[PDB]
Ligand binder design. Structure first.
Ligand SMILES: COCc1nc2cnc3cc(-c4c(C)noc4C)c(OC[C@H]4CCNC4)cc3c2n1[C@H](C)c1ccccc1
Length: 110
């Protein structure tokens, strides 16, 4: 990995760590729309994203730069904010995990 992609991998490990598990866990795996009874999910969300998919892409060297990695993490949060009413518990959890992400992403080495 490039230096910037090492920083991204560190962020990814933190987002998956026990430290943040209380609010990160809904983002660990793809939304199982059928299992959750969310039969409109794939009509509303055209590009699903989750941390297991970001991890697989990082492991496969899919991300060529930090910007491409960040676009997937933000897509994951944006999907949550698009699908769910803003007062829902899962949106509160998204906001908290995105705060962890944005503050550490901002510490990117130049
Ligand atoms: C113990 O609870 C069972 C349970 N397992 C899971 C697994 N993944 C979930 C993913 C989402 C989710 C995200 C993220 N972004 O968009 C969605 C939609 C999730 O969203 C809550 C919606 C379900 C019904 N409308 C709101 C829930 C997930 C989930 N859950 C439950 C249902 C849950 C509920 C509230 C907060 C977190 C998890």
């Amino acid at each position: 990995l490039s230096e910037q992609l090492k920083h991204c991998n560190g962020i990814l490990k933190e987002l998956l760590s026990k430290k943040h598990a209380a609010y990160a866990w809904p983002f660990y795996k793809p939304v199982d729309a059928s299992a959750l009874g969310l039969h409109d999910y794939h009509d509303i969300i055209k590009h699903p994203m989750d941390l297991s998919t970001v991890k697989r892409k990082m492991e496969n060297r899919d991300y060529r730069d930090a910007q491409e990695f960040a676009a997937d993490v933000r897509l994951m949060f944006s999907n949550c904010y698009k699908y769910n009413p803003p007062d829902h518990d899962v949106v509160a959890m998204a906001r908290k995990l995105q705060d962890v992400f944005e503050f550490r992403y901002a510490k990117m080495p130049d």
